[model samples]
Target: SIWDAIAGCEAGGNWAINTGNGYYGGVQFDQGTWEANGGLRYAPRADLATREEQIAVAEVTRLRQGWGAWPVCAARAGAR
Candidate 1:
């Protein structure tokens, strides 16, 4: 699945990580994006949320925004 690949590329397989660049979790979700996609109820941030939650919210985000969210990484991962 693309989510699996995205997670791998985004955080190097680290699901509970916060790199301090606004991005968080395995898919590196930013605060606004995360909350906008029904993430706040799951956790304060992506890293704080379970992998399942991140994947769930991210699927919605991907459907709405397409692969543009992870332009560099998804492109590198052959999304297009």
Candidate 2:
């Protein structure tokens, strides 16, 4: 789906990449965003999770913020 494309830009498609600075995993779920959206159910942090886990959590976040959370990549991936 389109989220996959967003992931491609978010972290070079490396789902396991932990960029630190609060950004984690393929979709760069910052600590607050990760936990606020229930990412803890999958893992304590986004990078500690699988692609499916991160993807699922992102879906929840999108529903919460209506795709505005990821301004850059969301638009790059054609989010509106």
Candidate 3:
């Protein structure tokens, strides 16, 4: 799954998010990247809260970047 892949690449590597750099969550989101999206109020610690929320945020980020299954493949077409 994309979420698992992202999580594995991020926090799984022991890379900590720098608050001063604008990164809050475990995914190492930049300030503009987080705030430009909807991660403003969400706590950086929220990344450790639940996989569901983490995946949700990842999905949103993917959509914003014009990535994700929708425009990429067939199965994602029917699900969306």
Candidate 4:
């Protein structure tokens, strides 16, 4: 539910912030992070900018890191 929680945050689902560059999304994927994480190849910049894309990537990363369904956002923690 991190997506819901983050979305409900003060920024209203805004992720990328003050990166000193033109970057925006829920997970804050800057040019470097985006490029390093296969932004142009596998995921692509345009696709990754979407809420669904960010949520999917975040969920995958969290699950792979064994986060154990831990919601990173407080807003969605109580949603369900």
Candidate 5:
């Protein structure tokens, strides 16, 4: 799955990862991106939400922003 591959590339498959890197979750969503993508509907941060929740937001962002949101990992994972 692209999501699984993206997670592995982004955060080593750790969905709840919060490395304090200003990004959160397996997909490594930055704060603004998460909020802008309606992640707030699930939790304050991507790391706080479930995997499905984060993916839901990611899906929206992906459609709107393409895989560019995760520039490196998305490319490496061959998303799209």
Candidate 6:
């Protein structure tokens, strides 16, 4: 799936990394986006959460906003 590509490109498949970039997890969700998607209920942050939870919230985010959320990475991942 495209999401697999996103995660691979976003964080090199490392789902539990913060890196202090404001982006978190393999799918690289920022704080606002993560919390807004019920990510806090799953964990403190996307990287802290399970891969399944990250993908779950990411699925909802993608459904709502499409691939524009990860413009540069998505393009690099060839989703463009």
Best by lDDT: 5
Model 3, span 1-80: residue lDDT tens: 65444544555533344445434445555555555556545544433435655456656766777443223332323323
Best by TM-score: 5
Model 5, position 21: C-alpha lDDT score: 90
Model 2 residue 1 distance off true place after TM-score fit, in angstroms: 1.5
- After superposition, the stretches of candidate 5 with alpha carbons farther than 4 Å from their true spots are none
- Give stretches of model 6 more than 4 Å off: 76-80
lDDT for each residue of candidate 1 in 15-48, tens digit (9 for 90 to 100): 8999798899999998999999899989999999
With candidate 6 superimposed using the best TM-score fit, by how many Å does residue 16's alpha carbon deviate from the native?
Answer: 0.4
Local distance difference test scores for all models: 0.88, 0.88, 0.49, 0.49, 0.93, 0.87
Candidate 6: pairs in clash: none
lDDT of 5 by residue, 1-80 (tens): 78888999999999999999989999999999999999999999999999999899999999999998988898888766
Q: What ranking emerges by lDDT with the best candidate at the front? A: 5, 2, 1, 6, 4, 3
lDDT, candidate 1, equals 0.88
RMSD per candidate (Å) reads 1.3, 1.0, 6.5, 5.2, 0.9, 1.6
Off by over 4 Å in 4: 15-18, 21-24, 29-48, 66-80
User: Which residue pairs show collisions in model 5?
Assistant: none
- Model 1 misplaced stretches (Cα beyond 4 Å): none
Between 2 and 4, whose TM-score is larger?
2
As for candidate 1, its clashing pairs are none
Model 6 clash count equals 0
Q: What is the C-alpha lDDT profile of model 4 across 1-80, one tens digit per residue? A: 55656554523556434334454455544455556444454455523455666666555545454433333443344533
